[PDB]
Design a protein around this ligand. Structure first.
Ligand SMILES: N[C@@H](CCC(=O)N[C@@H](CS)C(=O)NCC(=O)O)C(=O)O
Ligand SMILES: N[C@@H](CCC(=O)N[C@@H](CS)C(=O)NCC(=O)O)C(=O)O
Lengths: 211, 211
């Protein structure tokens, strides 16, 4: 079987869960922030030095880092390659956007939105400026590629990540209308993939309560 | 033709250059920190909103993010898949280590070593602790996988990145002997891939001068 160790309102976990839903993959979900889930990772803590969540357990194969989990699930499962194309150039655009999310978009958004929620970290003007730069960059990338989704004309695993990062801004009532291509993309995602957005919305609601 | 826009002593650039050498790919190298290189990216600055370096220009296809550049070069070129295996599980270990480098290993090392060199950023005990955690994690990953290299028994594109991150510690005379598996891996890399280490060493020497 497949088991996902996850944080119920963690954007990386929510990215992986959208992929599992899109691919129709049965799995056990362990929310490590829910009740006894805290201890349900003890069976493999020496194996994740980073205290790594999410972690995917595919029939004994343990894999961390949400980007790598998504790249693995999409290559190994599914009837076609549309969410992670095999063509090297098409794939490179997906891989680029996944790197952009990890290094820049979700890096700066998460530091401004979530870190102050759950830590003694402070929101600052500099953190706000970096959030604006990340949104500028994403708006420009959408304009440059010229397609409906972040790495193609249809959804890919890059969108699964970028959506959960953008949701962090919504969770704190951050107005994204200054980035019209990002706003249009986000609304289009929700309209065309309601069962995927539904997963992310459940996490958003938890975050709004503890904003 | 292929053109690489690079920073002569930038670890991400040096990772890509090792791949170009390993794959035997002829290319034009533009060091944007050398003389007139500063302006030689003006022909595509609207196209890289992040002020993105390195950037690969493969016959008109422009690709940023060093991880994505490496994943593209290794899939598109080369006679075998040993530096980026096609098998989904073997590939997932490479992808995981690339994510680990971006999110954690090079993230914390670069903030402790290089950012204070070239900015008003300060070395702190917390930054040192995070460097130690990153090295702990890498030592544990090498032990867990149990292989000679970071994602297999032979070199992969993950090693090209992890080597340039570790070089930043060497550039400031940081002793890595408390992490014996990392030290052994680093020395083995240099012994078995001298033409690749040579590229990285040239950048190290520039960084040592301005440490
Ligand atoms: N780079 C990792 C980040 C995962 C992550 O940050 N997980 C959080 C929960 S949202 C955690 O539990 N620990 C890491 C932290 O301190 O942020 C990924 O994409 O999977
Ligand atoms: N995530 C990017 C990082 C590239 C990067 O940081 N490049 C540096 C030179 S080493 C730069 O020129 N600008 C970004 C910065 O401010 O660090 C990658 O892996 O390619």
């Amino acid at each position: 079987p497949i088991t996902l160790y996850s944080v119920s309102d963690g954007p990386p976990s929510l990215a992986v869960r959208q992929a599992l839903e899109y691919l129709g993959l049965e799995h056990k979900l362990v929310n490590v922030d829910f009740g006894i889930g805290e201890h349900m990772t003890e069976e493999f803590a020496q194996k994740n030095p980073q205290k790594e969540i999410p972690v995917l357990d595919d029939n004994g194969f343990l894999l961390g880092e949400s980007n790598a989990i998504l790249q693995y699930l999409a290559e190994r499962y599914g009837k076609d390659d549309t969410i992670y194309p095999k063509d090297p150039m098409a794939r490179a655009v997906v891989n680029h956007r996944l790197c952009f999310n990890l290094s820049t978009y979700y890096r700066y958004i998460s530091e401004y939105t979530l870190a102050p929620m759950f830590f003694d970290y402070q929101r600052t003007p500099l953190g706000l400026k970096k959030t604006h730069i990340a949104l500028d960059n994403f708006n420009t990338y959408l304009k440059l590629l010229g397609k409906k989704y972040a790495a193609g004309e249809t959804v890919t695993i890059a969108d699964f990540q970028l959506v959960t990062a953008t949701m962090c801004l919504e969770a704190i009532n951050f107005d994204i209308s200054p980035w019209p291509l990002v706003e249009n993309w986000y609304d289009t995602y929700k309209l065309e993939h309601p069962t995927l957005w539904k997963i992310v919305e459940g996490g958003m609601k938890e975050l709004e309560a503890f904003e």
